[model samples]
Target chain A: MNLNRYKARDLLNLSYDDLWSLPSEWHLIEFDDGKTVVSVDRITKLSVLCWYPLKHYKDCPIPSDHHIDFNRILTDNPKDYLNVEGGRVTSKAMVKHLNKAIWNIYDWSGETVDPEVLSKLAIEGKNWLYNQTTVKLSEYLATLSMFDIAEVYNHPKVREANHNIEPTTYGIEKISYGKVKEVFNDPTQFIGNSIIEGLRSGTQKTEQLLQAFAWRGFPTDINSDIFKYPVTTGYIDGIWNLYENMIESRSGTKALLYNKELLRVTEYFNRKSQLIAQYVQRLHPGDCKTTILAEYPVTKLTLKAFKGKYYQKEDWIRGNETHLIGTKQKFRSVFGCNICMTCYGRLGINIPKGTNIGQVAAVSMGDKITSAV
Target chain B: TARAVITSISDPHDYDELHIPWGVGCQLLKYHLTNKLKAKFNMTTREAFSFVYENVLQYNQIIADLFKELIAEAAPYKGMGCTFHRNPRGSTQQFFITKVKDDINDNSISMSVLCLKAPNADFDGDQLNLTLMPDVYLTKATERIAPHTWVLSIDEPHEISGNLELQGPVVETIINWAHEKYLPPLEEWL
Candidate 1:
């Protein structure tokens, strides 16, 4: 655990195998700028040695007058730096070091790194690896015939490897708990629980899941005085002021610009208020059942078309086949206030009878609009 | 009426073209034929009339068939008490009882100016769905779903949902024109 004997230059000169045998401890490293403290684990020491000889700062081209801070440039915009001539080789080393660092941190600390940070690093690493592999693959493919290319593309092993790429990149364990207090305080856990339950049941449970997710984060109560008074007043006053300013300005282009801004504000508010209107009216699903036909035109089966059960990918007919459908167009010809069982489809079949279909349609559409915004 | 009668007497051919019931043929005859076709062909009046009439009849027949198809499509929900839903609903989905006005264009739905606010609709490329309401829902359709009932938005009660936003420039021009023509002031006694 004592790393007080070797200097930074000596440590850098050591081979990867020698560095890998070092004990983990804190070390003081000296740079041209100043001296700084750093942790020196076996993986960390090996990573330093891996990147040390790359000489990215000294070898890479830099503008004559512009100062190059390699650390800042590399960290902030790694892609631009890694796009140079010898950058790909440097990127490979960098990726290996980052992977090792993440693995070491996870093992030593027994706490997961932030998922967002890990995802970014994983994506970049995958991209670099894919690019390197693709270059070599393309070079090898040039030596083969057209038939070979086809054979390679249709290969099951290649397809399986392609499918495995995503899972492999995201393979790091993400489970971690920061604090006992923080664990129970977040509503996200509750949402996750519902999602898990919905997924496991394997029924039509996730039908209105989007609406629930949308509502949880959205402003549910419009009756609050803040939304009623200051928000409305502020929006109206701001718009009125902009209109007046446009009117007062004699310059045509300036006025036109102002008018454009005015419209943007108004249109945004218009859409938002409409969403609120839809939500407040409680216009959601209705109880009316759709009329099920004995047989429907196979061509008319759309995504909304109800099969006997919940529509699945397997339920989709590649060729024309007759099945009962609950088409709204057909329901128009039916005689009652209530739509028939077939037309109501599976969406309506489970609901209580005599529900207002209009409200349900409005609510469903409203949820879609809200989520889009 | 007088203009129609006078035009009919002066040139019966022109009158026939005018009276051809507005469609693709009528539009072509009005804007396209005289300016483009007549000058290009250099035909005599009689010859031009005959050629134009033949083409007009063909165009009109095609449009007539289209209209027939459209009417057939609308047949199920053409009667009173039927409600139509605007498709791909955004902002609002308008539901209005059917009142089949024959004068309106085949591809368009004509509603009162007041009804436009609720749906945020205009004469743009918006589509709607028409559904026939059963006898059981007729009363509810008239009482609840009718356009007249949409006076205020349910979300914001202070604002009239059916109120139209008049163009400021048009309103200003109308006011200026009104000011130019003076109306006598109300009597002091009143």
Candidate 2:
């Protein structure tokens, strides 16, 4: 009858419609709600999206170029994936709710985005949609269910209403109190937020254009002059805007800790990054890919009955070794299994150093890791 | 003889300006130009010219004073936000006009199209008379000449004999650059 220690966690943004591959079996999860439906079609699509990068015209069914009505932010279109249209449908719904959840998010300009840049991502989103295809639905669901997801993910307020009614609303219960799936996810698993400062516009190619000297001025051809005024002004304006946002957001945003998991994941991903730095330092200059297999042993023991009591010896440690191995890379990097020499190098891990375990397993049960990646 | 070859060969006996598009260097010049442009979309002759004008001409410096002003305005990277004390190249065309108002009237008499490259970039190789192009062309006077393609730098075949590229940091600097130096209003001259 003792209390389990709790760790402070951070949040992540997850889209419900798009499914992800569970990094491990313990990651397979599903909510037991009665109303949620998994039609043969929906299950098939979701299954494919969770494990592979291949796109099925049927799953992502590229509708005829005809349905590409951006009048409503045409969430689906196939051809535009190759060639983009000029206009965008407003996200009045997305705007209304996100702003409602986090009030006062925009500037006086109502400029939540850059018309030029956002339009590009919108086109890419419709055309470039993708997800995993290797694992099955049952496997994906099982893997997601292993983690303490209820406490690891977050959701907007409007979604709070459907928590009681949806199918696979598995993560909903966890997000109710604030952190969700990614709280355990670290910077390593975390991809850079495609959006950076001034990225509110979503344009990712600014650097390349500048490098190409795509502007008007002294060296410009006859047409170069026309661009000088627009480009120079736009770039400077982007710089000035970020400055303004910093000043205006300083009071509230200053206290924000930006995702801690992101910071931790960076530590996990960085060991390999460091090795790369080390390799680069050593002069083995070929493109290097690293595949990490981090593992450790824990009691795997918890309250089965919640009288807050459990037996240690009879617990499923042996039965769960595979699951444990699969997820150790994830949680190990988060709790920062003291195994990582650099993990504690930064935060100064409070855990006693001698207690951390050793052992990175074979890639899979019988499969061996021939290459690092 | 230290080492010099007479550049003219077309033997034009009538025309006053001798801007002849000679053969040898001219053939290689087009190939090299096409090769450089192949990095982008498939190019036609007009497209090559388009990319040349767009990439090279846009980078050329025009005004000296306001350009210097933009240099002074954008001087964060080094000599940004300042103007050139010396003259900036007005054009990339090789023939330097000698007359005041004849056919081309030596562009200097009219003092048109002045500008400077912004601090962000410079014309090191957008257009030019390349080594691959013709071997010789007309001299500034009146005679057949060589061929060359202009590149990142302003000249057709030569390095900058003289001129500076300017960059800007502020909108006011750009507007000033446009109005005072770069903007050549022909109506006012009339």
Candidate 3:
């Protein structure tokens, strides 16, 4: 989902069809037997013929005798009648002739040439050149069921770990508010519901979330950007412990509370004891779902636990903490994709180093106080 | 690492018994072979030499003619600080000829000599390694060993003692090889 956080694993998840359609710049192909991706530059240096002798497009596997000559041609002092047309030609001259022919076929600017052009003609309306001297190229290509030219870092895990993924999917979870006041009053605050869901989810979710921030399965601590956050999943046990009493009491009472749960009915505002308090109070019994009632002890306790476990504090003395929200700094996770080397170097943004590039900018910032202290 | 080591004759005391008189008879023979045959082929000095090294002078007639010229064209000169040496490596002296070229031209000819130290070792054989170097002995020698001209330092000449008569046949082939196969530096030689 986050286009910028693409990794190597995502590359492997692509179907063969998807891979075949990739741009040429992203891959290299062997033009002979074809279809194997190598480094692009290495492909250019290789012979047009498959280094391994195999069934070619429309042509039978070249037997040992001829293959030996071809191999000899690769060397400078081939011990055979040098060229097909010649008696005693120098190996250099013969090799040059083959390479030049190959070059004309490919229209490559380099000196690389395909030797097969010596005996083959280009199939009309196709990219392949086949041995017309010996067989009907059209029939051969059909028989072989192949079109010509064959078979065709960054982060170590930026690709491999994503191999099983739909590369387009982003790890970020958009926080939706169950409470309107929570949404309007504290736009930047971390959503407790999302965190609880994430913590409750299995390792698959936690693992994905973690690597999404690091851009790899393991967050390397060699540099500042990599270990930007401590492993957040490690604290889930502590977090769950922090809210045990609150969660336990709520679970037990929810069964009996048809709701015997205590709720604050009203607060006298401006000392006027406004009449609307009664009006707001009247709706609470009729439509408990939509009514904005005073905070219950359970809800307040859960918030406290969330704050203690994950929230960033402005200062210890003031006991004042604001919701963490900002673009990713090197020391913390962002709400979106993991920061990669390219963005880290070029964008001047610090990507968090751990498993927490979540929707809140400061979800991973909780580790900063610990890492620094 | 297979380098050429030319066999030089020592002991200037015996320069008299050999009628060639060390340096005097040598320069004339060299001039006869390199200059006369280069014009004979109607080729530039450089081409004439390349003709030999490249097998264009494989004709026995050219070798015979060059051999005849070395015998007949007698123009003797001062021996001063010059003597001669035979290349002892081979009879045909192919490797010796190659190294002689290395001595003179330094970087012109690059022949790749692929010695298979192991049964399965990869080596690039296309590289050529050679240069054009005169095989004549300078009683005194300097780094300037070119076609028809070589300077030997009189102060510290590398000397070898042998029959002056044996030196004659060695210097004769040396003259033949130097001239017929004499590749010049591309500038005026071309």
Candidate 4:
């Protein structure tokens, strides 16, 4: 528990095995560089960069450290970075970051979650999803339950027509209202909305070429550029979009200097957007197959409930101890953990001041950690 | 380095000629406004562009004078706004207000909003760069704001730097029609 008695050299020399095998009492290892090693993943991922010591992806590299590799953003070609057919932020990345944040909430002062607790949270989120839609979810997303599938499917249609539903819906809930679901459930009607039209006409990625990008619900990319302009803007529609291709994309448009003059660019933009209105006339449920169905509120409900409420930080925290160890936790000239870092110094543990925990843990328990992994 | 300014709103003839950098920046700014106005106001391209262009002076003046109005409304942090004379980066002047301090020594972290202008004789137009960074002093701080580079064309505002690597505030707003129009709306969510 007392950190100052350890030296950077001694800690740095410790192998990963030593650190992992150490009694859990050695909660954190401090370093001369003002960085602390809290977990094993922190070392392999290079969380301890030269200027700052904390969590972040690698884009800028540190040369002194051989483990650091190339920066991805600096090296990728500009063109491919802007467009994509997939979601800009993938579901996996979202979960990973969310997990990291939640982990911080639980383990900041000490490891509040072991494998078992984390496993349980996943099951809870999964079951919550299943309760709404009766669909099984991804494991990375975690566990769920079962129910009478046929009854769940049939429950919506028999809604008493005369029953008064809640008169108002707000924010994200508006989309999930039963009446709204009813309209979307209609094979012929749900596909006709003007907003959805924009998305269809906007992207050539789908069968409704004419309807692609007509729906403004999403942008060609996040910055709000409609995908329609790329039709003539020297690129295919879906090829240059979102998370993977942001390097080569623009927000509203590339029209500021497009080969065509403003007058013509406007004509092209407006003219293509008009096609959505016509396309909507022929749209039916198959066009929106994944959206909603009389028998399946599962998908719709799953989306609605999961939008913004789950994993709220407030619900996860146990107390101040649950807070992520302050980013301010550092390798000061002296090392100690009082109620705070400053409270007890030399009187604390015997580790020398300014020692990297990775090295210390390695030397202390290197043989144990190396094989354990 | 060239920066442009609004000479007058009387007509195209009244507006000053633009240099490469400023023209590029302003043209992009103009395109975004024109495109947004066309959709937002239900007007034709000519009508939207002309209307927005003709009033360019007012918008420019309004932003310079009241840009703080926006910074105040949206900035999540408590900070002050003030005007500074001189340029280390070659712009002639600036009306600067930021949610974070420019002095890296302060050990503060936040986004910054700066409006820069170079006199027409220098061949550039007005510019605004919203930069997010943390002060240098926090060694224990995490690196979220770097490679730390984001380049947005002033005129062709939509053609901003890459986004795959950036999940920060700049990527969230780079494609906006106009910072003036978009900033207030986005302030709520950010």
| Reference-based lDDT, each prediction | 0.32, 0.23, 0.25, 0.27
Alpha-carbon runs more than 4 Å astray in model 1: A1-373, B1-79, B88-106, B134-143, B155-159, B162-181, B184-190
lDDT of 3 at A81: 22
Clash counts for all predictions:
17, 99, 50, 73
In terms of docking quality, model 2 is incorrect
lDDT of 3 by residue, B1-190 (tens): 1222222222221211122222222223454456766766677767655544543213345644564454444334222222122221001112211111212223222211111110111223222222222443432232122111101111111111011012122222212221121222222221
The best candidate by TM-score is: 1
Instruction: Write the residue-wise lDDT of candidate 4 on A1-373 in tens digits.
Output: 2322333234334543563343422123334443333222222222221122112212222221111111111113433322212112221232233233334334443533332233233323322222221121111121122332222223443223113423222311242233334543343432323222222222112323222211112224434454432221112224454532453444334633543343343334333434443332211111111211122122333433222111212212122232333322222221222112222211112222232323333333422332232
Candidate 2 positional error at A284, Å = 15
The sequence of per-residue lDDT tens digits that candidate 2 reaches over residues A178-251 is 23123212323212222111111222233432312111111223222221121121122242445433433442
Ranking by lDDT: 1, 4, 3, 2
Question: Candidate 2 residues B40-152, lDDT tens each?
Answer: 44667677756444532122222122223322432322221111121121222223211112222221111111122211123342222312112222222211120111111
Candidate 1 lDDT, tens digit per residue, A119-214?
A: 233333333323333332232221225443343234343233223222211221111111211332332333223222223222213323312211
Better of 1 and 4 by TM-score: 1
Give the alpha carbon lDDT tens digit for every residue of A57-101 in model 3.
222222222121232222234333223221111212223333233
- Stretches of candidate 3 off by over 4 Å are A1-24, A28-35, A43-373, B1-3, B6-113, B116-190
